[PDB]
């Protein structure tokens, strides 16, 4: 609610219609408007349970109300809102086959890629049929951790708990599996505006920017950014120019195109890591310069706000400070994951044993 | 499955840039003018301009500067596009044939980057050692001017200062040196850097950084013998050069921001300055002599010359003549006299050049003859604002100056007049309310009225207003269709903006009313929380208040709907009926919106344009009196306008200057699939579309069966460009697409830019080739190429003339096709 200097929306809109004022000023004002209306999301719309804990989340890119989610026990759910047709389910071993990475297929929306603790990077349908296994550990106590895909390049990529990343085509053709790190890789991600430089994060207190076509020589990498603590995720923006990274103790950093090494800014925020808790992953908003993250208080962290609850915090990217706080009782669990729709009208949250939807207010005639 | 054809009817008129130099020959004085895709080249005369050439580029000219490398007998021309196409061009004339030959071209786009807030900046060192470009924060792109740099390869230098206000190359430096003003939490400051090519880095500039005025906004690099730089701000003007420091604070400049400058004397001794209110000033440099023979700046003085259109740019030509290039008003040629007239102005207008832009709204009416449509456009902005009346038989344009800003227009046949929403600027008076700065249509009407609806003042609060805050005062004007005299003016409430207007009949009532939607405006509100629907009746030369309805939000759009009134207020759509007692009564509501700006109708279907969520198709359900959601465009797009081509085809325009066409999913077997519109057409227009409207300018040959085009939708743009969109069958689309490819292999692109790249769908999020759209301008370009090359275009081309069997196409066949196509606008 509390917001900084800004005014004259209809004025700015007409000035844009005249060509006087540039578009980004309007974009700033409307980012402010979106946060303002986000302060009226307070009425939590929907809750959804199933069995063992949620571990990974993904949005159907084309459709707003549908979402896919993967559990701690190999349990996948596909769920649509306003349908009430008893959502789609598939079970797994339930104990040690925790899926941990999940993105939709841009081609066949009723498919999905997945990375499992069983040691099986697979591509499987929501109907149960395993389409194709992509890799394998072939030795237990060695499993996969990370996964992503790109369509413009037609590439698939996935990371391990030991330090090596794999890169395949949609029809196999594996020319990769060189080692990148010495320990587990939490997240990996591809650029949207270009197609052939990559980002990876790990427990090594380092996050790495790669050139997936040019480097082949066992740590002849392109760039390496250090950290004070491990990193749970490093995710690109949709514009491709601002890279977000998130630690385990208390930090977020924004790196630019210009000198990947040096940082533009650091966004301190506590999301302290824990064993049985699902690891925390900050995320962009696809069409603004906002960031949305879940909080996990630490009594020792120097809080700027005087009220410290298990809240969902939102920030502006290119400034550093906050603009909104989501909270709803009956949901005092801790939203490990939070992801806005690529559409831009709906938000999904993953708490322990719960999936939540935070949509906007329904008005009265 | 949707195939459309789009063509320009009136090229853009707004001026984006202007420069002077010696381009066509060392002896010629040339003026170059940029209107957003068009480059016009004139010769300067004692009396004015001789037109020499007009070209289109496959690109938006963003930078245009002339330069003369060593060893060249005449200047070369550097141009940069918004898609980051850089090119160096040379003028070549032989006989009556003039062609611009490509000496250099290359794409300076980065693999990644965010375009900057103050936009693209491009500058060229006075000694032609390098070109500098500011595209992204934190970077400075350098194109070295080597003879071998035909690909215009470049290197990046980090810039520590991320928020740059302005930058220029300095004169009189023995190495290339930049001077620029930037913003940081400490304020605004000015700094310099030398540019080392061999290190590919900045080096320390010759003189230290200085703090400058908080609104320091423009930098001018001063040539020798003065050297140094002038920094222009909102409240102060400073000059800095090494140990030299001189500042002035003339009160005169406080009323309006200086936004453009121009060098009068090659040695820098005088400048012209233009402000946001169109005032034109002289800036005079006083010399101070020194024993060593150099000359430094002793003092600066400013003298008001007069008033012009609000100038985007200025160029002094010669003999006291100045060209004033405007995007907001008509461009001008003015004459500078040494002595003033009776009122104290030194400016006299010589020539006026039409500007249609900004086109914020327009409508088609058969003013004179049935079937002969004429366009009436809301044109211009502030004191330069106008109506423009355009008719065929190429085109005759009548200008009606309004001296204020129009917003919407509709025609009310039964009263034989037009209603126009307008707004003027007022400032605080000495002791009272507010006062206008000059007379205008709303202040020069035949009759006047004042409001009395006190529903607005619900918990009014006193706000302290600093001295001289400007305000927008909105009015409804009643205008004679024949004489365009101001028949009536109705002033709305203070701080209330009127945004939408319709003239229509309602219910079973045979009277016609003017309906206006408004919003109460306070500075601190992120969105409006209160507004009005106001129903007026026009008779006996005045508006009479018929009805009012108060709502809690801004009424973006309204339309008559089967005798009912549909309205969009921020995130809601409401439907009102007009009762026997002359009030609006709600039938039903729809709620699932972010911000519903744009509405259009056909039958019982409604196309909703969102601020940020591209377009939505709703249907009114007459047998239950509520809405059903039919389909939605699930691709996010920041809309600027929408339009219904027909029951099955839906047009949209987005901030990245692209158009798209959506359809229902015909191959859908489920409600979920049926609810998804598919973006089946895409096209980079290169313009900002504010308004579509149904109508046509060309005389309709009633019953003209078997023409290529179907439907007719005109649209208006900020730059004054007017275009037409129409629908096409599949076969004609295939024919004309093959024609596009063949022509594109033939046409010489200035800067060697590919046409597909130019017309390619392009945003910061995605770049895709165009689809479903024919570039009518490209097709029209067939007629100006030589006949052998026309035969080349149709070489090995299979063609079906009329209805029959396919055969080889001849050049004459395609000449006839394109000639027939030219008559649609």
PDB file of C-alpha atoms in Angstrom, chain A residues 78-211:
ATOM      1  CA  UNK A  78      -2.175 -31.583 -12.448  1.00  0.00           C
ATOM      2  CA  UNK A  79      -4.887 -29.204 -11.324  1.00  0.00           C
ATOM      3  CA  UNK A  80      -7.250 -26.741 -13.007  1.00  0.00           C
ATOM      4  CA  UNK A  81      -9.441 -24.170 -11.279  1.00  0.00           C
ATOM      5  CA  UNK A  82     -13.128 -23.568 -11.885  1.00  0.00           C
ATOM      6  CA  UNK A  83     -13.493 -27.087 -13.321  1.00  0.00           C
ATOM      7  CA  UNK A  84     -14.242 -29.228 -10.236  1.00  0.00           C
ATOM      8  CA  UNK A  85     -13.516 -32.414 -12.217  1.00  0.00           C
ATOM      9  CA  UNK A  86     -11.460 -34.102  -9.449  1.00  0.00           C
ATOM     10  CA  UNK A  87      -7.884 -33.195 -10.523  1.00  0.00           C
ATOM     11  CA  UNK A  88      -5.424 -35.497 -12.273  1.00  0.00           C
ATOM     12  CA  UNK A  89      -3.050 -37.552 -10.146  1.00  0.00           C
ATOM     13  CA  UNK A  90      -0.190 -39.991 -10.459  1.00  0.00           C
ATOM     14  CA  UNK A  91       1.556 -41.729  -7.573  1.00  0.00           C
ATOM     15  CA  UNK A  92       5.102 -42.967  -7.065  1.00  0.00           C
ATOM     16  CA  UNK A  93       7.221 -44.893  -4.574  1.00  0.00           C
ATOM     17  CA  UNK A  94       6.359 -42.319  -1.913  1.00  0.00           C
ATOM     18  CA  UNK A  95       9.512 -42.461   0.250  1.00  0.00           C
ATOM     19  CA  UNK A  96      12.784 -41.639  -1.545  1.00  0.00           C
ATOM     20  CA  UNK A  97      11.851 -40.798  -5.129  1.00  0.00           C
ATOM     21  CA  UNK A  98      11.388 -37.089  -4.547  1.00  0.00           C
ATOM     22  CA  UNK A  99      10.993 -35.249  -7.824  1.00  0.00           C
ATOM     23  CA  UNK A 100      12.889 -31.966  -7.567  1.00  0.00           C
ATOM     24  CA  UNK A 101      12.702 -30.286 -10.976  1.00  0.00           C
ATOM     25  CA  UNK A 102       9.731 -29.789 -13.267  1.00  0.00           C
ATOM     26  CA  UNK A 103       9.045 -27.615 -16.297  1.00  0.00           C
ATOM     27  CA  UNK A 104       6.305 -28.030 -18.862  1.00  0.00           C
ATOM     28  CA  UNK A 105       6.875 -29.204 -22.406  1.00  0.00           C
ATOM     29  CA  UNK A 106       6.325 -26.218 -24.745  1.00  0.00           C
ATOM     30  CA  UNK A 107       5.174 -28.706 -27.422  1.00  0.00           C
ATOM     31  CA  UNK A 108       2.827 -31.237 -25.781  1.00  0.00           C
ATOM     32  CA  UNK A 109       1.301 -29.521 -22.762  1.00  0.00           C
ATOM     33  CA  UNK A 110       0.030 -32.844 -21.389  1.00  0.00           C
ATOM     34  CA  UNK A 111       3.657 -34.026 -21.045  1.00  0.00           C
ATOM     35  CA  UNK A 112       6.389 -32.965 -18.651  1.00  0.00           C
ATOM     36  CA  UNK A 113      10.073 -33.416 -17.951  1.00  0.00           C
ATOM     37  CA  UNK A 114      11.200 -34.436 -14.476  1.00  0.00           C
ATOM     38  CA  UNK A 115      14.258 -35.095 -12.326  1.00  0.00           C
ATOM     39  CA  UNK A 116      14.001 -37.636  -9.529  1.00  0.00           C
ATOM     40  CA  UNK A 117      15.883 -38.851  -6.505  1.00  0.00           C
ATOM     41  CA  UNK A 118      15.406 -42.359  -7.907  1.00  0.00           C
ATOM     42  CA  UNK A 119      18.114 -41.476 -10.445  1.00  0.00           C
ATOM     43  CA  UNK A 120      15.879 -41.129 -13.510  1.00  0.00           C
ATOM     44  CA  UNK A 121      15.656 -37.922 -15.537  1.00  0.00           C
ATOM     45  CA  UNK A 122      12.448 -38.747 -17.391  1.00  0.00           C
ATOM     46  CA  UNK A 123       9.902 -37.279 -19.767  1.00  0.00           C
ATOM     47  CA  UNK A 124       6.454 -38.581 -18.901  1.00  0.00           C
ATOM     48  CA  UNK A 125       2.781 -37.878 -19.533  1.00  0.00           C
ATOM     49  CA  UNK A 126       0.149 -36.865 -16.991  1.00  0.00           C
ATOM     50  CA  UNK A 127      -1.679 -40.075 -17.988  1.00  0.00           C
ATOM     51  CA  UNK A 128       1.130 -42.217 -16.500  1.00  0.00           C
ATOM     52  CA  UNK A 129       2.934 -43.418 -19.618  1.00  0.00           C
ATOM     53  CA  UNK A 130       6.680 -42.909 -19.363  1.00  0.00           C
ATOM     54  CA  UNK A 131       7.636 -41.489 -22.746  1.00  0.00           C
ATOM     55  CA  UNK A 132      11.424 -41.627 -22.423  1.00  0.00           C
ATOM     56  CA  UNK A 133      14.174 -41.754 -19.840  1.00  0.00           C
ATOM     57  CA  UNK A 134      16.883 -39.183 -20.596  1.00  0.00           C
ATOM     58  CA  UNK A 135      19.703 -40.201 -18.250  1.00  0.00           C
ATOM     59  CA  UNK A 136      20.407 -42.434 -15.285  1.00  0.00           C
ATOM     60  CA  UNK A 137      22.703 -42.723 -12.308  1.00  0.00           C
ATOM     61  CA  UNK A 138      23.008 -46.544 -12.604  1.00  0.00           C
ATOM     62  CA  UNK A 139      24.233 -46.480  -8.969  1.00  0.00           C
ATOM     63  CA  UNK A 140      22.075 -45.488  -6.011  1.00  0.00           C
ATOM     64  CA  UNK A 141      22.992 -42.688  -3.564  1.00  0.00           C
ATOM     65  CA  UNK A 142      23.815 -40.646  -6.710  1.00  0.00           C
ATOM     66  CA  UNK A 143      20.818 -38.731  -8.067  1.00  0.00           C
ATOM     67  CA  UNK A 144      19.784 -35.765 -10.196  1.00  0.00           C
ATOM     68  CA  UNK A 145      18.855 -32.366  -8.766  1.00  0.00           C
ATOM     69  CA  UNK A 146      18.205 -29.821 -11.539  1.00  0.00           C
ATOM     70  CA  UNK A 147      16.446 -29.633 -14.882  1.00  0.00           C
ATOM     71  CA  UNK A 148      15.366 -27.164 -17.554  1.00  0.00           C
ATOM     72  CA  UNK A 149      14.496 -27.090 -21.257  1.00  0.00           C
ATOM     73  CA  UNK A 150      14.468 -24.621 -24.152  1.00  0.00           C
ATOM     74  CA  UNK A 151      12.390 -24.741 -27.332  1.00  0.00           C
ATOM     75  CA  UNK A 152      14.012 -22.079 -29.521  1.00  0.00           C
ATOM     76  CA  UNK A 153      17.269 -24.034 -29.202  1.00  0.00           C
ATOM     77  CA  UNK A 154      15.617 -27.450 -28.729  1.00  0.00           C
ATOM     78  CA  UNK A 155      17.819 -28.382 -25.781  1.00  0.00           C
ATOM     79  CA  UNK A 156      17.368 -30.152 -22.455  1.00  0.00           C
ATOM     80  CA  UNK A 157      19.710 -29.750 -19.489  1.00  0.00           C
ATOM     81  CA  UNK A 158      19.939 -31.292 -16.039  1.00  0.00           C
ATOM     82  CA  UNK A 159      22.172 -31.233 -12.976  1.00  0.00           C
ATOM     83  CA  UNK A 160      23.347 -33.683 -10.315  1.00  0.00           C
ATOM     84  CA  UNK A 161      24.309 -33.870  -6.635  1.00  0.00           C
ATOM     85  CA  UNK A 162      28.030 -34.373  -7.398  1.00  0.00           C
ATOM     86  CA  UNK A 163      29.012 -31.592  -9.802  1.00  0.00           C
ATOM     87  CA  UNK A 164      28.273 -32.674 -13.380  1.00  0.00           C
ATOM     88  CA  UNK A 165      25.662 -31.365 -15.805  1.00  0.00           C
ATOM     89  CA  UNK A 166      24.121 -33.160 -18.786  1.00  0.00           C
ATOM     90  CA  UNK A 167      22.845 -31.605 -22.029  1.00  0.00           C
ATOM     91  CA  UNK A 168      20.719 -33.526 -24.548  1.00  0.00           C
ATOM     92  CA  UNK A 169      18.523 -32.946 -27.572  1.00  0.00           C
ATOM     93  CA  UNK A 170      14.820 -33.778 -27.605  1.00  0.00           C
ATOM     94  CA  UNK A 171      15.678 -37.041 -29.441  1.00  0.00           C
ATOM     95  CA  UNK A 172      18.706 -38.090 -27.389  1.00  0.00           C
ATOM     96  CA  UNK A 173      22.093 -37.207 -28.923  1.00  0.00           C
ATOM     97  CA  UNK A 174      24.036 -36.729 -25.713  1.00  0.00           C
ATOM     98  CA  UNK A 175      27.264 -34.721 -26.081  1.00  0.00           C
ATOM     99  CA  UNK A 176      27.824 -33.540 -22.501  1.00  0.00           C
ATOM    100  CA  UNK A 177      28.200 -34.879 -18.894  1.00  0.00           C
ATOM    101  CA  UNK A 178      31.479 -33.142 -18.212  1.00  0.00           C
ATOM    102  CA  UNK A 179      31.833 -31.993 -14.626  1.00  0.00           C
ATOM    103  CA  UNK A 180      31.117 -28.364 -13.737  1.00  0.00           C
ATOM    104  CA  UNK A 181      31.279 -28.238  -9.939  1.00  0.00           C
ATOM    105  CA  UNK A 182      32.585 -30.316  -7.044  1.00  0.00           C
ATOM    106  CA  UNK A 183      29.239 -30.673  -5.207  1.00  0.00           C
ATOM    107  CA  UNK A 184      25.483 -30.473  -5.756  1.00  0.00           C
ATOM    108  CA  UNK A 185      23.933 -28.112  -8.320  1.00  0.00           C
ATOM    109  CA  UNK A 186      20.668 -26.609  -7.079  1.00  0.00           C
ATOM    110  CA  UNK A 187      19.405 -24.807 -10.187  1.00  0.00           C
ATOM    111  CA  UNK A 188      20.243 -24.192 -13.833  1.00  0.00           C
ATOM    112  CA  UNK A 189      18.602 -22.016 -16.448  1.00  0.00           C
ATOM    113  CA  UNK A 190      18.689 -20.948 -20.079  1.00  0.00           C
ATOM    114  CA  UNK A 191      18.469 -17.484 -21.597  1.00  0.00           C
ATOM    115  CA  UNK A 192      15.198 -16.507 -23.359  1.00  0.00           C
ATOM    116  CA  UNK A 193      16.382 -13.753 -25.726  1.00  0.00           C
ATOM    117  CA  UNK A 194      19.502 -15.581 -26.775  1.00  0.00           C
ATOM    118  CA  UNK A 195      19.799 -19.364 -26.900  1.00  0.00           C
ATOM    119  CA  UNK A 196      23.372 -20.441 -26.150  1.00  0.00           C
ATOM    120  CA  UNK A 197      24.677 -19.143 -22.839  1.00  0.00           C
ATOM    121  CA  UNK A 198      23.624 -20.772 -19.617  1.00  0.00           C
ATOM    122  CA  UNK A 199      23.543 -20.215 -15.853  1.00  0.00           C
ATOM    123  CA  UNK A 200      24.143 -22.726 -13.074  1.00  0.00           C
ATOM    124  CA  UNK A 201      24.137 -22.573  -9.286  1.00  0.00           C
ATOM    125  CA  UNK A 202      25.518 -24.975  -6.733  1.00  0.00           C
ATOM    126  CA  UNK A 203      26.402 -25.535  -3.108  1.00  0.00           C
ATOM    127  CA  UNK A 204      30.001 -24.472  -3.862  1.00  0.00           C
ATOM    128  CA  UNK A 205      29.398 -20.845  -2.799  1.00  0.00           C
ATOM    129  CA  UNK A 206      29.717 -20.007  -6.507  1.00  0.00           C
ATOM    130  CA  UNK A 207      27.326 -19.407  -9.389  1.00  0.00           C
ATOM    131  CA  UNK A 208      28.591 -19.927 -12.924  1.00  0.00           C
ATOM    132  CA  UNK A 209      27.733 -18.485 -16.353  1.00  0.00           C
ATOM    133  CA  UNK A 210      28.479 -20.867 -19.210  1.00  0.00           C
ATOM    134  CA  UNK A 211      28.600 -20.862 -23.007  1.00  0.00           C
TER     135      UNK A 211
END
